C-alpha cells in the first residue's frame, strides 16, 4: 500500500501541458523542461546514452506526448533502376513483383515512372534515366498489365525516401512507409517531399469555408487514351468528398475515354484510381522550388512536414 505509492508516483505524471510563465527573459527550468524534447540519437558512450535516455521503453525518456516514432520499410533494388542523384524526399512506388521468391525490389520515383508510362519533365526524365529499356522489363508485361487496366492494384505506394546509401551493384534504400517523415543523420535536418511541378496539380487552386488542421496529399494513376499518367493532387478535404470531386474533375476525360474509343471489352471500364499518401500542414506547405541536376533543372513541389500514411487504391470511374 506504500510500494503502490512509489509505483503509482512513477506511473502518474503526464507531461505538463500548461505552465504559468512570468517573464520571457527568465528562461527558467520549468519552461526548459516544457520545451525539451529527447532525440532518437546520441553518441555511443555510457554518459551520452544514459543522459539522452536511448534505452527507455516505448519512447525516449531520461531516467504519450502525442508523438510516435516512424516505421521504416527497407527495399533492395537494382542500382540501375534508381538514379541515385534524386533527393531525399521523393515518393517511392514499389511495384509488387510477380516473381515468387524475389528478394530484390523494383521501386519507382515518379520521374522513373514517367519513362515507364510514355514508353522540363521529359528532359529531366531522360537525363536522369538515359535507358528506357532496363525499366521496361522490371514490369515484365507492361502492355498487357495496362491493356487489361489492372495496373493500379499492383503498385503499392511506400511513401517517401529518407536515407539512401549508394551501393554499387544492388542498392539499399530506407523509406518511411508510415508515420512522421524525419531524417536519421548525425546532424538531423528536415526532410521535404519533392514532387515534380508539371505532375503535381492542386485541388483548392483548381476549384478556386473552414480551415482544416491538415491537408492530405493524393496520388492518382489514370488510364487515358495516350497512356497512363501519374498526377499528384493536394487536397484539404476528406476522402469521400475527394472521390466525387475528382469524378467531377475527370468527367471531361471520362467522356473523352468513352468517346475516342468505345469499350467493347469489360476490363477497360475502370478509369484510374486514387490513393491517399498522408497528411501535412495545410497552412504553409508545398513551397515550390527547382531540383538542380548536373546540367538542367525541373521545377519541383517541396512539401515540408509530411506525416506519411498510405491508404489503399479506390477506383474512380
Amino acid at each position: 500500500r506504500r510500494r503502490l505509492q512509489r509505483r503509482i508516483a512513477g506511473l502518474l505524471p503526464p507531461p505538463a501541458r500548461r505552465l504559468n510563465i512570468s517573464r520571457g527573459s527568465e528562461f527558467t527550468r520549468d519552461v526548459r523542461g516544457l520545451v525539451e524534447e529527447h532525440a532518437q540519437a546520441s553518441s555511443l558512450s555510457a554518459a551520452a546514452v544514459w543522459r539522452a535516455g536511448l534505452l527507455a521503453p516505448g519512447e525516449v525518456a531520461v531516467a504519450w506526448s502525442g508523438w510516435r516514432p516512424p516505421v521504416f520499410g527497407d527495399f533492395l533494388i537494382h542500382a540501375s533502376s534508381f538514379n541515385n542523384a534524386e533527393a531525399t524526399g521523393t515518393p517511392l512506388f514499389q511495384f509488387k513483383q510477380s516473381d515468387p521468391f524475389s528478394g530484390v525490389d523494383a521501386v519507382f520515383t515518379p520521374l522513373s515512372l514517367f519513362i515507364l508510362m510514355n514508353h522540363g519533365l521529359t528532359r529531366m526524365a531522360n537525363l536522369l534515366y538515359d535507358s528506357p529499356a532496363t525499366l521496361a522489363d522490371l514490369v515484365p508485361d507492361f502492355g498487357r498489365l495496362v491493356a487489361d487496366r489492372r495496373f493500379h492494384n499492383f503498385i503499392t505506394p511506400v511513401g517517401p525516401l529518407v536515407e539512401n546509401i549508394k551501393s554499387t551493384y544492388l542498392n539499399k534504400i530506407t523509406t518511411v512507409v508510415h508515420g512522421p517523415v524525419v531524417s536519421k543523420a548525425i546532424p538531423r535536418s528536415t526532410v521535404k517531399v519533392t514532387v515534380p511541378q508539371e505532375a503535381f496539380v492542386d485541388l483548392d487552386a483548381w476549384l478556386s469555408q473552414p480551415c482544416p488542421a491538415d491537408a492530405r496529399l493524393y496520388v492518382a494513376l489514370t488510364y487515358e487514351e495516350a497512356g497512363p499518367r501519374f498526377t499528384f493532387f493536394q487536397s484539404s478535404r476528406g476522402h469521400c468528398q475527394i472521390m466525387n470531386i475528382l469524378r467531377i474533375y475527370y468527367s471531361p476525360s471520362i467522356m473523352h475515354r468513352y468517346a475516342v474509343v468505345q469499350p467493347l471489352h469489360i476490363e477497360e471500364l475502370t478509369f484510374g484510381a486514387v490513393a491517399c499518401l498522408g497528411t501535412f500542414s495545410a497552412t504553409d506547405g508545398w513551397r515550390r522550388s527547382a531540383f538542380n541536376y548536373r546540367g538542367s533543372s525541373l521545377p519541383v513541389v517541396e512539401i515540408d512536414s509530411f506525416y506519411s500514411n498510405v491508404s489503399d487504391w479506390e477506383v474512380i470511374l
Binding site: 510477380s98 515468387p100 503499392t156
Partner: protein, 292 residues
C-alpha cells in the same frame, strides 16, 4: 502504458492443448473487452462462429470489425497472456495460419472471418469447453480473389443443385479452385456439398448479392428516369425500356431493400480491420505491422 490482457483459465490445460497453442503463438484473435483480466468465453469468434448454429459471413464480419483484436504472446498452462492492438503503435505478428498464404513486405493484411473450415483455424480446448476460433489473416488482394471465388462457387453450386442442366461441376472447379497472386498458385478447399435450405456458410452473403443484382436493373432504370445520354449508351436498351410501370409501394420497398443490401455488401467487401505491414521477414515468418 501497458497492454497485457491476461485471460485466465478456470480449469488448467493438458499438454497437447499447449502443444497446439505453441504453434499458434503469433496469430491474432478478437477479444470481447479491453480489460486487464478476462475469462475464456470472450475470446475469438466462439460465440458467433459456433458449430451448433448455422454461421454466416455477415455477422461474423460485423463482430470482427466490432471488437478489439489481439495478437497472443504467451501461453502458460492456466493463463494466456496476450496483448491487444491499439492504432497508436506497431506490432509483430506471424503467419501461422493453416491455409498458408505467403505474405510479403509492405503488403496490406485483411483480418477475415474463417471460411476454409472451422478445423483449420481452431484450438479445440477440452479442459474448458471452449473453441478458440482464430480469424483468418491473409493479404488483401488474395482476400479479394478468395471472396470472389468462394462467392461464385456458392452461386454456381446453388444453380447446379437447382438444375443439373445449368453447368458442369468440373468447369466451376477448374477455374475457381485456385487463387493466384504473384505466382503463388494456391488451391482452395471447397465444400462441394453445402446442402440446400442454406444451413451453410456463404449463403447469406450470396443471397444478399443475388437479390442485389436482381433488383439492380429497375433500380438503374428508375435512377436514370429520375434525372444523361452517355449513361443511356453504355447498357443495352432492353434494360432501359423494360417496365416503366410498377406500383409505387413495391417500387419503394424494392429500392430500399436494394439500398440496404448494397450498403451492407459494399461495407463488407471493404475487409474491415485492415493491417498494413512494413518488413515481412520469412526467415522467421515474422511480419511487422500496425493497426491501419
Amino acid at each position: 502504458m501497458d497492454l497485457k490482457v491476461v485471460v485466465s483459465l478456470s480449469s488448467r490445460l493438458y499438454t497437447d492443448e499447449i502443444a497446439k497453442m505453441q504453434q499458434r503463438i503469433g496469430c491474432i484473435l478478437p477479444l470481447a473487452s479491453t480489460h486487464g483480466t478476462q475469462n475464456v468465453q470472450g475470446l475469438g469468434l466462439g460465440q458467433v462462429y459456433s458449430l451448433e448454429t448455422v454461421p454466416d459471413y455477415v455477422s461474423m464480419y460485423n463482430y470482427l470489425s466490432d471488437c478489439t483484436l489481439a495478437v497472443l504472446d504467451e501461453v502458460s498452462v492456466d493463463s494466456l497472456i496476450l496483448t491487444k492492438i491499439v492504432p497508436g503503435q506497431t506490432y509483430a505478428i506471424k503467419n501461422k495460419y493453416q491455409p498458408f498464404f505467403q505474405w510479403h513486405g509492405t503488403g496490406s493484411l485483411s483480418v477475415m472471418p474463417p471460411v476454409f473450415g472451422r478445423e483449420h483455424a481452431t484450438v479445440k480446448l477440452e479442459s474448458n469447453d471452449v473453441d478458440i476460433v482464430f480469424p483468418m489473416v491473409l493479404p488483401t488482394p488474395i482476400a479479394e480473389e478468395v471472396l470472389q471465388k468462394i462467392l461464385l462457387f456458392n452461386v454456381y453450386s446453388r444453380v447446379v443443385m437447382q438444375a443439373p442442366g445449368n453447368a458442369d461441376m468440373l468447369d466451376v472447379h477448374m477455374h475457381l479452385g485456385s487463387v493466384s497472386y504473384l505466382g503463388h498458385h494456391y488451391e482452395l478447399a471447397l465444400p462441394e456439398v453445402p446442402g440446400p435450405l442454406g444451413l451453410a456458410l456463404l449463403d447469406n452473403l450470396s443471397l444478399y448479392f443475388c437479390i442485389m443484382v436482381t433488383l439492380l436493373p429497375r433500380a438503374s432504370m428508375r435512377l436514370v428516369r429520375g434525372l444523361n445520354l452517355f449513361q443511356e449508351m453504355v447498357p443495352d436498351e432492353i434494360a432501359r425500356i423494360d417496365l416503366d410501370d410498377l406500383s409505387v409501394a413495391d417500387d419503394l420497398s424494392r429500392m430500399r431493400v436494394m439500398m440496404t443490401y448494397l450498403q451492407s455488401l459494399a461495407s463488407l467487401f471493404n475487409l474491415g480491420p485492415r493491417l498494413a505491414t512494413a518488413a515481412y521477414s520469412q526467415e522467421t515468418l515474422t511480419a511487422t505491422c500496425w493497426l491501419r
